[PDB]
């Protein structure tokens, strides 16, 4: 389960997931899973999607994960009032804008590629699409 | 050379700036044919409230 190995600060502001992503081109591998919709992936969902990917393509086929959470989400305990400090950190999330390449993959056919990403895409909350690396 | 300005909308839920700009143009109420000489300023004042005015 992915998490930042130490940080400056414990608790972070909510912010606003807005605009468009930068990691748009498939950089390392041949294929990849691009996020069409807007949202935010948890540390659990990324792991859960990676497990389902890795298992679909066996020992073979190298995988890369482009996203990383690094934004702590707080939660108030049940049966507690408003105020009195900020809530404790429960899980970590990456904010995902349209055109963020989530996962990449290399060393497989396009036939067996799509079937791996279809399993992963079901684990994720975001609406996604398959993408291919192009020469410029 | 003169330019006939007219007001074509209310000045109620507008910004202080836009309530002022009409006061500068001399547009008191809707349906008011005013005539001002053409300058770089006045066209800026029209342009600033382009939505609520008309040129003739």
């Amino acid at each position: 389960m992915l998490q930042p190995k130490r940080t400056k600060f414990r608790k972070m502001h909510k912010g606003r997931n807005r605009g468009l992503a930068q990691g748009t081109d498939v950089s390392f591998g041949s294929f990849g899973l691009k996020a069409v919709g807007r949202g935010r992936l948890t540390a659990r969902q990324i792991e859960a999607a990676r497990r389902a990917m890795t298992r679909a393509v066996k020992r073979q086929g190298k995988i890369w994960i482009r996203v990383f959470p690094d934004k702590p989400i707080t939660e108030k305990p049940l049966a507690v009032r408003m105020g009195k400090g900020k809530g404790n950190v429960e899980y970590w999330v990456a904010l995902i804008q349209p055109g963020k390449v989530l996962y990449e993959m290399d060393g497989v056919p396009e036939e067996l590629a799509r079937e791996a990403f279809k399993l992963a895409a079901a684990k994720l909350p975001i609406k996604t699409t398959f993408v291919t690396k192009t020469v410029m | 050379k003169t330019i006939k300005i007219t007001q074509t909308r209310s000045a109620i839920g507008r910004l202080p700036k836009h309530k002022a700009t009409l006061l500068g143009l001399g547009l008191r109420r809707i349906g008011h044919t005013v005539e001002r000489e053409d300058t770089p300023a006045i066209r800026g004042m029209i342009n600033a409230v382009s939505f609520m005015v008309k040129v003739e």
């Binding site: 996020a35 349209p98 055109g99 | -």
Partner: protein, 92 residues
Amino acid sequence: FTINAEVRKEQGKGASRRLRAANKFPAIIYGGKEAPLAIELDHDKVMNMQAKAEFYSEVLTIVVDGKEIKVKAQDVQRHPYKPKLQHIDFVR
């Protein structure tokens, strides 16, 4: 690898989007001692032309107002998620 392309007159965000939402898109030609020239062109053709690898290597003879300009595709701006082109940078 011939493409018939038009010269632009309107340009800016307002123009570029009105263009880009009409099965066309903006591009530009530059390089050498000559002046840089802005281009309007069809989407559907250039979308199919870039299927082959030769598009990102070989010389392209772009037809403008009769004259054939010899260029190479230097850079391209992809649309964030949809499979489509926003802009092309042709070099002479």
